[PDB]
């Protein structure tokens, strides 16, 4: 049996991990058990006060996020996508399966880390994006998982097959729209409903967003050419969803680009290549662990266009974490993870 | 095995029935098969062109809605919440399980039917709201189910325990907000995104809405008093969800009303009574078959207040249909029906 | 000339007052001048950092909210709809025209005030709802204005003509949906976009909302019958707008009720009575100072239904303040206040 | 006095033209009169049945769109952004001021027109984007105006100063999010509220969108180089607003690019260059004729980034039409056109 703790249970990523665990077949047959649920504030409150959608766990008392509380759990989700978990991870029993939703163990270049995060690089753990070349093998039986960022998940799935096949130039452009749950649950004026509803805005533009080097790192793993990444995130008035529009120069026939996506994804159950003449929409993947992808060539502009839609909280965060957890535990990789969206 | 057809498969209710069937344990172990998917238009198209979220069924070819196509199935969902199924249903065998999402077999008073629907009364089938007193008995082993309207589902769950215990007056007021998927998929200018987004409006007010007599009928069934119903629906800029605010005069203490709701709902798997101090929200029930209910007493106004939140497409439509299906077939009532919402 | 200060300039009400002042004909011809803009935090920031829509004032430096900063202004808007301005108002020069967006000077019953607000009653100032009987005369040349709450504005406009004519019973029910800007700009988890989008919820139900006695007070001014108010507010995923559904028992002919609304509003430029067969929508009044009102009778339920739509930030807050300011200064009452909404 | 007709009055662009005319100073002092309001359907209905926000015109009777009805007016708005006005415009006098919101007279290359629109090229009229180099000269005293498309307006304001100064490469990438009112009022299933709310999707990708050659044409006019345009539009769940993210390779320093934008826009009343450290948002420009623009350089990616926010219905359509009208008639260009957004 695997007893699971969720640190940061009261945030959006933590609530979504718990939603997926409650629906997981190992929860139903007793193999997966939900233990301590912790938060940095509001210890002593009940979970229902934070996540009224999780009624089977409503009565659970939130505990402080402390190593002692997290002891005795075979797996610990560090559900702080915008936090720094290196210090807490060091405090846990090292045989624990530690699944970090944050960034501390994602990057593999210490100088890049220090430039973008302002601290000493902690190192890296197996990246929880099983569809990326070579990634699945590193996750089988791992006791450490670095969950990818939500935007890099969409951009890498959209772009890596074309670049791996050397069919596009290695200077890529990504403009990705995101619902606001990706910002997490910390209350700020700029994330208030009145501000977000009816409005769209780019933010952290022109290379300052910390997911820029994460996209570059994933792409550099499938090519030896010099990769550059122009990444612009755009907040839109939705709660969930990322639609990444990804471009690069190309002079390759569309059919050869489509063949590269076929080769990458034909046997990947969470990656859906759109039928000819269809394009992804985030509405179709909400609540699912799926990515819907379409590709095209703008011949006049000599530009490849790849569109990818994911649910930022599922395939971009908690679904990635659970998918990687399945691989870590030797369980069927698709367990608990639907490809069917909740639409409209 | 139970071979199931879905007529009206390309509409919202039909797509949500299919989502639930795809996740149903009887589909997973082969006891339930998804057969013919039909529509009144676009026969020959594929389901993926209508429901991109249902990728496991994307290649299914939509067939014409005809009694011949629907014969040879053990169960038939008539997934036309705004259609009139009487003529088609009369062509199907009494032994075929028919689950009608439309209104034709909901009402038990022919004169009321004629007044509000302007046609001859087709009859009455067991009402697919298993939590109503006596309803579960009528559904077990039925081959006929009339699924309730979405607004009546919310209003009846909010009000029937108080009224059945004679703890409120039988003159009730319901003001219910709803997302736009309740209107179905028929394109009209009043339901365009640009019109609906950022706007709220009441419609079909002051007793002309056809769900008014349906609420009255369900409430009359739990009391011996003349029931009157003031029902105002309000369209809001959401795709799913109904939040029903329901009021009635009372002279009874809150403690007695609370006890009546506990007694009615403590063992009901889909009905969640909010802990004291918490109130329902539609976000918490989206994608689930749950209803979240809270009750209160306005002492100064001598008024009972009951709030109910449901997903209009699940507990208000397709989830009720599948729940009643489970009962009709002798399967565990909760099969395929989660109480956990997809939030935020 | 009238030099105007706005205290609380960085909140939503303060930003909307400034929007209306910038468009006011007295600003254009030099008679109205915009002076100090203050806030409790962020003094030294520029206004553009808080209200990027107010580009003509973007460079203004926010000053601390202090009596000394507000001196030398002929009119001071206390744009703190959820604050308590009695202490600051006492510090201003008493000949100043003081326009309080908060509640401290709205209520006329000290015991009611203490019950709902937990403090000693400060008194009352002329209520800034000029269409209410007797209200306009108290605002002409006043140096004090208590701006109404947003929900009472909608409910009182919907209900007072029927009650004044004694055509409905004095026990009224109000269920009002509101966009989230009415909560103000203080960051809380429950007002975050991810939480608000796609969700609706009632709050402060069963008589605990402080606008309940404000509605009762306005209605008691048009009748000597004992008034009771059941008031339920519902948050919906819009930034602006209140749609109030208001009911009461009646046995009066609809035509007599319509005549009462005609008598009240035929000469009121901001009150639009819907043509027969039309119903209000908040989308149609956004950005305008208008209220759109329809009335009906549910004969089966013996219930009067009145629907009122306003923009909560204009007719429900800042437009009420500017309308009352015009009356205070002896300026045309409609100056700077459009009846045309910004739709879709 | 200038008697104005609006053909297509019942659509979104027509309603927004009428909103602006109602607030125009020439309407207030009688120099502009609103004459015939026409549509291709529902002649005989009243305007209030189409545009409930335009209550001062609610009683106007919609007339058939015919050259006879439109004659006898000094100015005619053809408010059909997706219509083809060539045949109707050829029936009107050269001395009548015609302002076409549609595309028929925008393009200057007949072969490009035939390729993208599949019809004979009707000709070219002065392009209604007064801020483009040389455009104001062409509009003064014209009797013919082709209003720009909404996406080209945003992309050209974002990009032309950099390209005209030869500070970026002439291969540009535009990814622009838009609210749904840009689609007009024609009811289709893909534009239903339930579909659009909570979803984002790219459409008409990889060079098939008809605004691609329009962007290319406007950019070609400021440079001597071959221009290529990769343009991806993305529909988001808002009613109004376009946020264009525009990129191009560059070797020029940020200081030089910033200076070029200051030089181009410092005296342009509707173009607001964001203070350093601020970025545009569509919420800040809704209901205004303003464009908010920020520029940046991604040094690692050697990429220039320009962000532009407009209201698609004002600066992208009806505001551009009225602005160009003012120029054609010799009225102050800013008459009736505020730069202040209606936010939140
Ligand atoms: O961009 C990010 O890294 C992340 C985010 C992700 C998706 C959408 C919005 C969003 O905003 C914030 C705000 C604070 C901290 C992190 C984020
Ligand atoms: O009210 C209804 O009966 C139903 C509906 C339900 C929820 C939300 C909107 C809505 O609108 C329409 C429109 C056409 C036909 C039926 C409906
Ligand atoms: O209800 C209110 O009095 C007011 C409010 C008005 C409209 C919409 C939401 C809303 O929520 C809050 C939250 C905090 C303080 C005041 C409010
Ligand atoms: O893209 C366009 O040309 C235009 C449009 C503009 C903004 C947003 C959506 C939108 O969709 C449609 C649909 C039909 C016809 C034109 C459009």
Author numbering:
A (entry chain A), B (entry chain B), C (entry chain A), D (entry chain B): 9 to 352
Verbatim from the authors:
The L-arginine biosynthesis pathway consists of eight enzymes that catalyse the conversion of L-glutamate to L-arginine, appears to be attractive target for anti-Tuberculosis (TB) drug discovery. The arginine biosynthesis pathway consists of eight different enzymes ([Fig fig1]) all considered to be essential for *M. tuberculosis* growth *in vitro*. In this work, the ligandability of four enzymes of the pathway ArgB, ArgC, ArgD and ArgF is explored using a fragment-based approach. In conclusion, using a fragment-based approach, we have discovered inhibitors that bind to novel sites in ArgB and ArgF and to the active sites of ArgC and ArgD, which in case of ArgB show on target activity against *M. tuberculosis*.
Additionally, structures were solved with 4 fragment binders, occupying either of the two distinct pockets: the substrate-binding ([Fig fig2] and [Fig fig2]) and the NADP(H)-binding pockets ([Fig fig2] and [Fig fig2]). As compared to NMR571, NMR322 binds deeper in the pocket ([Fig fig2] and [Fig fig2]). Enzymatic assays revealed that 2 mM NMR322 inhibited ArgC activity by 45% whereas 2 mM NMR571 caused a 37% inhibition. Although the thermal shifts obtained for NADP(H)-binding pocket fragments NMR401 and NMR863 were higher than those for substrate-binding pocket fragments NMR322 and NMR571, the SPR binding response for the latter was better and positively correlated with percentage inhibition of enzymatic activity (**[Table tbl2]**). Our results further show that in the case of ArgC there are two possible strategies to develop inhibitors, with one targeting the cofactor binding site and the other the substrate binding site. It is not clear at this point which strategy has the highest potential to result in potent inhibitors.
